[PDB]
From a paper:
In previous work, we have investigated the binding preferences of a PDZ domain that is known to interact with the C-terminus of the cystic fibrosis transmembrane conductance regulator (CFTR). The CFTR-associated ligand (CAL) controls the apical membrane half-life of CFTR and is a validated therapeutic target for the disease cystic fibrosis. We have previously described a peptide array-based approach that enabled us to design a selective inhibitor for the CAL PDZ (CALP) domain. The result was iCAL36, a decameric peptide with sequence ANSRWPTSII.
In order to test which positions can accommodate a modified lysine residue without a substantial loss in peptide binding affinity, we substituted residues at the P−1, P−3, P−4, and P−5 positions of the iCAL36 peptide. Substitution of an acetylated lysine at the P−3 and P−5 positions yielded binding constants weaker by ∼8-fold and ∼24-fold, respectively. The structures of CALP bound to each of the substituted peptides were determined by X-ray crystallography, for comparison with the structure in complex with iCAL36. The refined structures reveal similar peptide conformations in the binding cleft. For example, a P−4 acetylated lysine interacts with the CALP α2 helix, whereas a P−1 or P−3 acetylated lysine faces the opposite side of the peptide binding cleft, and a P−5 acetylated lysine can access either side of the interaction pocket. The other three sites are negative, and S−1 and S−3 are more negative than S−5.
Author numbering:
A (entry chain C): 1 to 10
B (entry chain A): 284 to 370
The structure:
Amino acid sequence: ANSRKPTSII
Amino acid sequence: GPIRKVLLLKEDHEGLGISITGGKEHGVPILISEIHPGQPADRCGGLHVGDAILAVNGVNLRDTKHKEAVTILSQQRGEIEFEVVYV
């Protein structure tokens, strides 16, 4: 399945 | 657009106040996806949603994987210089 782009908080 | 050198002043007790996406394993730059209101990136100005982060404190982030970029970015302290561009 397609996935949302990994996002990180910094 | 033009590559900019942008200064951010961060206290040792807080994070940068940015969300990022991308990196080498995605075939795109480290990109700013959010600038968090009332946190250092917001207060210091110069950093905007959609900017690619090319380097921090002289450390090249152009060919860096996402996780390793998170490590490098999160490890910086104090007066932190970003090299960024909007394309």
